[PDB]
Design a protein around this nucleic acid. Sequence first.
DNA 1: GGTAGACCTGGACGC
DNA 2: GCGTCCAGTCTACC
Length: 314
Amino acid sequence: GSEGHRTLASTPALWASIPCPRSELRLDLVLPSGQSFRWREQSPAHWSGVLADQVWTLTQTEEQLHCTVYRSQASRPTPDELEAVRKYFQLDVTLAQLYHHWGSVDSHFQEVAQKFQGVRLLRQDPIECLFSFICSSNNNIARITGMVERLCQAFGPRLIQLDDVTYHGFPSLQALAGPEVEAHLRKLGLGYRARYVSASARAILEEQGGLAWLQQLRESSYEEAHKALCILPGVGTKVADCICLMALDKPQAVPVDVHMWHIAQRDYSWHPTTSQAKGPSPQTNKELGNFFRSLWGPYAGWAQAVLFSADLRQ
DNA sequence: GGTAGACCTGGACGC
DNA sequence: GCGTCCAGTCTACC
Ligand SMILES: [Ca+2]
């Protein structure tokens, strides 16, 4: 009863509400591995994970976002705690407003977007996002989720246990920088990315000024930020964009990959013009990214998320 | 400066 | 059921 993951039905007195229409947010479209890889629908329509260093379970109704915290006497979330939720979902950004603009300038978005309202971007932690996406390169979402999970089990701070699940917070730079971590990661299956995680941790900590460095990029320019990020091992343009776009408040960053070429090509008949080659290449990927930035504007990245959600569901 | 190949893993095809 | 193919960075190199 008071054990296991909670539910809106089962322990009512424990949930608080955040005004939020399913049109402005769709948990089933945002939390599935892709932006973050740490949320799990442990119970239908109920997603659990670590948010702001505590475990929560989120579920929604047609006009309400219900939340629940596990921290020591159990109680519905406090108001401030709920804010952390709004900050994470960047609720002050109005999806209706953004969708309208994109629709206005792009008939195809206009079409496709209808069935997939409520796709926004999570404001993630630089560290987690950096390393989560270092694991994403030349890989698929299934393995990535697995890799990230093992990584957090083995190196992240132990949080609280629900049923047979012991939550962990994302590892720290120090942790990831520790000795013999690479051999450890290799044993978890991150393959060659094992070294990348190990090296980027040490690199940040011993060559760029530590944690503060990343935290400074939130204030720098996308151009600068993306630039700086590329230094780290296993971090190219793509991963650099993911980080800028999902944790460094750079909403115009557009992560270009084979996925995107497919969309650019079959939905816009897009061709590289000022570039050289006909297929994917550093110059051509740079172009594809510019194409969408001028087509969608300042929040191009957010827009891309919408097409990706609608696409995969087909 | 702008290409090619190589690359840990493991679920998908295709033969 | 085996071998090839998918799902970004990095480096050797013309
Ligand atoms: Ca590929």
